[PDB]
Design a protein around this nucleic acid. Structure first.
Length: 107
DNA sequence: TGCATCCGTGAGTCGAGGGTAATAACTGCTTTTACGAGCTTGCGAAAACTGTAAACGCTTATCCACCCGTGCGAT
């Protein structure tokens, strides 16, 4: 089994469990590998990062929880690896170039 | 020294059903008291509006250290 089949399984590993507290100590242990070694092979298969991409699906989930659900900004961050919305609102100007308040207005 | 008038006594719980009636003047005249009518203050409400330290949600400016963007290495 080549490693390009490993990371193909890893793209369906998280697509249901980004609302869960999913950390690297779960992803590495339930893959059969170590904590660091999964990140070296992750570059040569999809050209992007791993610890930011789980945020990139988490910040994708916050936008589809804002354009559909009435949940506030402060405690969507509580389930997605943040302890407050102060940093969680800040990276959204990097990921989608918008404010977490301004997305729901422009339809 | 009787004799004659007089004041003061006379069980206790309950009970039922209730309260009266005879008879008595008219007039003109003058002073006091009440009853409704109509105001005057004033007092408790409704409906607006001008001063402050927090007043509901929410962005940034920072600092920093867990983690690890990757590379290269461990047997």
């Amino acid at each position: 089994m080549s490693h390009q089949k490993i990371i193909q399984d890893l793209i369906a590993w998280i697509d249901e469990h980004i609302d869960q507290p999913l950390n690297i100590d779960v992803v590495a242990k339930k893959s059969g590998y170590s904590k660091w070694y999964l990140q070296r092979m992750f570059r040569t298969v999809t050209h992007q990062t791993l610890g930011d991409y789980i945020r990139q699906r988490r910040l994708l989930l916050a936008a589809v929880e804002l354009r559909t659900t009435e949940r506030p900004i402060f405690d969507i961050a509580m389930d997605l690896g943040y302890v407050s919305q102060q940093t969680f609102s800040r990276v959204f100007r990097r990921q989608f170039d918008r404010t977490p308040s301004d997305y729901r207005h422009r339809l």
